[PDB]
Design a protein around this ligand. Sequence first.
Ligand SMILES: NC(=O)c1ccc[n+]([C@@H]2O[C@H](COP(=O)([O-])OP(=O)(O)OC[C@H]3O[C@@H](n4cnc5c(N)ncnc54)[C@H](O)[C@@H]3O)[C@@H](O)[C@H]2O)c1
Ligand SMILES: NC(=O)c1ccc[n+]([C@@H]2O[C@H](COP(=O)([O-])OP(=O)(O)OC[C@H]3O[C@@H](n4cnc5c(N)ncnc54)[C@H](O)[C@@H]3O)[C@@H](O)[C@H]2O)c1
Lengths: 435, 435
Amino acid sequence: ELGVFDDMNQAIEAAKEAQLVVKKMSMDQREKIISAIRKKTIEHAETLARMAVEETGMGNVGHKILKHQLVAEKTPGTEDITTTAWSGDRGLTLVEMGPFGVIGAITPCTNPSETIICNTIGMLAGGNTVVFNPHPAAIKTSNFAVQLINEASLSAGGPVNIACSVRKPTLDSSKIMMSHQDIPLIAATGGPGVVTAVLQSGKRGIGAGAGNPPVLVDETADIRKAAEDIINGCTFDNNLPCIAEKEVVAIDAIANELMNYMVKEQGCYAITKEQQEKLTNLVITPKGLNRNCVGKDARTLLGMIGIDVPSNIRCIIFEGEKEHPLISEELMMPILGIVRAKSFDDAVEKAVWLEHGNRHSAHIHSKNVDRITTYAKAIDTAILVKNAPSYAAIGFGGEGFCTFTIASRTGEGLTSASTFTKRRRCVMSDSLCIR
Amino acid sequence: ELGVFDDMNQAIEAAKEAQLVVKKMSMDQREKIISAIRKKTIEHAETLARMAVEETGMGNVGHKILKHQLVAEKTPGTEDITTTAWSGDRGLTLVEMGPFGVIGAITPCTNPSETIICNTIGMLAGGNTVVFNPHPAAIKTSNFAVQLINEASLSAGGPVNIACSVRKPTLDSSKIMMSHQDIPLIAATGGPGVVTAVLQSGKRGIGAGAGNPPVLVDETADIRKAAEDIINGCTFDNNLPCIAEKEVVAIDAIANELMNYMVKEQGCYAITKEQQEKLTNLVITPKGLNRNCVGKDARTLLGMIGIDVPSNIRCIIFEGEKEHPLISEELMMPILGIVRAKSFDDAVEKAVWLEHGNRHSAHIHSKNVDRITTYAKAIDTAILVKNAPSYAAIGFGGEGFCTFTIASRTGEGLTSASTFTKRRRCVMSDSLCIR
Ligand SMILES: NC(=O)c1ccc[n+]([C@@H]2O[C@H](COP(=O)([O-])OP(=O)(O)OC[C@H]3O[C@@H](n4cnc5c(N)ncnc54)[C@H](O)[C@@H]3O)[C@@H](O)[C@H]2O)c1
Ligand SMILES: NC(=O)c1ccc[n+]([C@@H]2O[C@H](COP(=O)([O-])OP(=O)(O)OC[C@H]3O[C@@H](n4cnc5c(N)ncnc54)[C@H](O)[C@@H]3O)[C@@H](O)[C@H]2O)c1
């Protein structure tokens, strides 16, 4: 398989060779390859989407098609690589974005191919190559994407091996990557474990970690639209996205109206206390999150505990306290608790607790500029969406570019080509200021 | 002593308290404190300069005064914290630079107070506070600077403890910093050891490591001025700066002219083979760089091996091969070998070897745009200065701002306030595009 190797040292050596060419390619040459990658991503979006759902059992095909189309359309390319200039009597000083070299990347089972293609487009734009250690549960989908990238590059005239991977990823192959002297940077997309591992590696690590995004709805919101947006955001790819709404904090005065719209118009099923207990018992196991429930749709999860609901149902909701395990924990399931708040200050406090200091994502429905400001300052997240579904944060119905690697822990935010470059100052003394 | 604590946990707790206030201060409020820090740095520059030379035995007072004046004048303040906006029918998306929190910093014995004051100005501007583990050989100078910063803040109305430190820094206090859960970021300014340690810490590390900066002089250069600039750059603060010229690669045709100007006009003393052997034996010990020679002036180093030279002498020079230990090693001494090159491609090769893949700093004297471009691409350094002394790279006679923390290893380049912030995207959906 193209770009795929039997062991991690081979993969890195191949990437290192390719990068000696990529670093000397024109922007127009990189951009021709990037353009081919975008094209083939759209052309094979259906195949990538169904492969991921088949292999992992998580998410859904239609939404994954939209995610791949988003990656293709809105991931930045070489235009993201920019230059500054300062000039005067003392000359001309430029600051440029140069390559790191061969970048290592550790990718998730939730958005396997999305992360690989997005990372690759950005890293290539800056003159790097990339080697992946994919999630072992999504290895076929991940390596198919690597194969596609290399096909796209060949169709543009090479080189081969701009993106490389391994046939069988292990913690051993990941340790080879994290101690390899030809890898100065690793981008980890996943949970707290992998982020910590990379930040202990002796290399710069970009840490894109976990979240538990609250959405606050106050009494000044468009409540009918808030119901639509929140359920749309929560249930997108069955709640796999790290940015998605995973619990609601609602001001008392509008909480009933909100929940009623959710049930009446947005395909939500309200579960009783008894049902909550049974669902909790299923989805949180003695060994943690039940991997056989992650990324499953609502009707399936309800069926698993013997609740037969019609197929118009796409989300499970209930009112509860913030400490309820289905509200406090990141489930990546279309299960959405509503926490009632007595006042806006109460609601902000509740939301801040629920975000658990991840500083990842949070959302609000409010039309009031002061309310928005207060929440935004307090919650201090890499992402904040106002009056839209969560997916507006990555360019799906919001201004701005797409990424699938949100560096919550290390502070680089929504990563793009510029993230994966080294800054270079060049001082031309006493010449080339033409003023 | 103000801002100084008996142990590292106390220091961090104090910094954490102060940061809850700093993060809510206006830019105008931070800038009033920064302005007071700049003022007191200038007012006490003579004291800081002489304290460092007295305590460490390295460098010289007059040059250290200029370095502190540079820090005060050209370190960026709150103007370095900037915002982007994208807007259209889908609304308004901002990207802001928010604080990390309490930043840890590990600082050198070469530029102790310069690094502390520069780091503090930048970190404060972004809403952070900072805790230092200074170099134990410069602890008095380092903590005097911390004391000055806190005095400056008090004079501006507080808070106290924006910059904190410890009475006695150890590897134990450094380990407390690197495992502390209230520290999400550490800025390490020093050699390969400390950079590696921070990149193993489980936190984001900004790694400002070692160099061995070559200066290439080709046959199109202004050779008389190249001699002046190179010796000025090399001998500044007795070659302590990490950016300073530490060896020359000279095209054959101009090498004699260059060296002759150095001897005749720039206070250089040309040492024989025999003298080279004796100097090597002194300055490189069985245990590595001789700490009793680092940062000493040329006349002193020559005296130490029994060579009496007049006091017009400020640099030791000789012609040699690139592998000569006084040419290949970063000495931080005004000892400057000249390596003769047969052709420009030869000269670039030699310079690239001499830089040792640090990707830190390199310099060139050439008036030819193609020659400059070829060298710049090949040497791939955070800093490149053309036709000036090295110190043009940090705003001393070149366009651009000052820093004392150049993140060669981790890629952030010349660090400033913006470096020490977390990126935050805020998506206001379907409103606040006024076009
Ligand atoms: N911030 C982001 O951009 C982002 C994007 C997608 C997913 N996520 C997060 O990731 C989680 C879901 O994805 P997942 O289950 O694939 O994540 P995961 O953390 O279980 O796995 C991600 C990758 O890290 C590897 N990994 C895990 N632990 C490791 C360790 N100790 N050492 C080395 N490698 C290790 C896995 O093999 C995989 O390749 C959720 O918490 C989600 O919020 C974050
Ligand atoms: N890139 C830059 O901005 C920059 C600036 C100044 C100095 N330097 C480099 O630093 C060196 C000279 O300074 P120095 O002798 O003070 O550097 P050093 O590396 O000996 O010490 C710097 C700091 O790191 C600490 N330290 C050293 N080893 C450590 C370890 N294993 N764990 C934890 N802490 C450790 C020291 O106590 C000190 O506070 C030169 O190589 C120079 O080029 C680089």
